[PDB]
């Protein structure tokens, strides 16, 4: 499974895609619109999303791929940081982590990785118990 | 089991203590050798350690942390993000994921949560694995 980035400046989305391909398959979109129909249509594990973009935001995003795709592991770039009501958003959102713009890219290789982990360790979870189902009842 | 918190400065140890304590069981260490103790007594999920502690640094600390509980998920807290030895130091040590000094409450929240899930999640894991065992083979 993919990560997939969704950033509306051309030149961090590109470093970021930098940072994490020698780790990961890595998507890009450059806002909300084309990375929903990245979605639709390949097998994401991990998204990035930066919170401020031209129309819709990151946190509104983020809500709907919380409610169509549940097991992703969703991480925001945002600043205002020390914002009550931005931290309170991602909470609702059901957002994982948050990084700090501009995004430290050691810290974000580290969340993709612990992001992916997260997701390969929930998935295995699922099978081992699907096959004991198999195993065990008749 | 535990989240393990170590910090020499009493205030922002007892904060961070206030931040978790909701969410988690929190044991405190005023430094390594003091958190070395815990952690050959008491059941510990989590690990969030500064950097900078009169002697024995965080990342001396959990280097040892990795060789003697290496299913523990490490946090350190540190500045000097931007030195590239600094970052290639907490690689080396095996640590998961640093967070910027100061540590930011609702980041370091996010982090314990990620962190204890990732360890929930591994240990189900390996739950999972040997009782599929004792049900296959014979
Ligand atoms: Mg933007
Ligand atoms: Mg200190």
Redesign the pocket.
């Known amino acids: 499974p993919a990560i997939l980035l969704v ?3 051309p030149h ?1 989305l590109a470093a970021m895609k930098l940072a994490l391909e020698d780790d990961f398959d890595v998507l890009t979109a450059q806002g909300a619109e084309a990375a929903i129909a990245i979605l639709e249509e390949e097998w994401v594990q991990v998204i990035i999303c ?5 129309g819709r935001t ?1 946190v509104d995003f983020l809500t709907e791929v919380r409610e169509r795709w549940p097991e992703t592991v969703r991480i925001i ?1 945002t600043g205002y940081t020390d914002s009550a009501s931005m931290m309170a958003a991602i909470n609702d959102a059901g957002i994982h982590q948050f990084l700090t713009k501009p995004w430290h890219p050691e810290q974000l290789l580290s969340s993709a990785r612990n992001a992916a982990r997260m997701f390969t360790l929930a998935r295995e979870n699922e099978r081992l118990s699907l096959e004991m189902r198999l195993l065990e009842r008749p």
Do not use: A, L, T
Request: hydrophobic share 20%; proline share 9%.
């Open positions: 950033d509306d400046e961090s930066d919170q401020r973009m031209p990151g770039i």
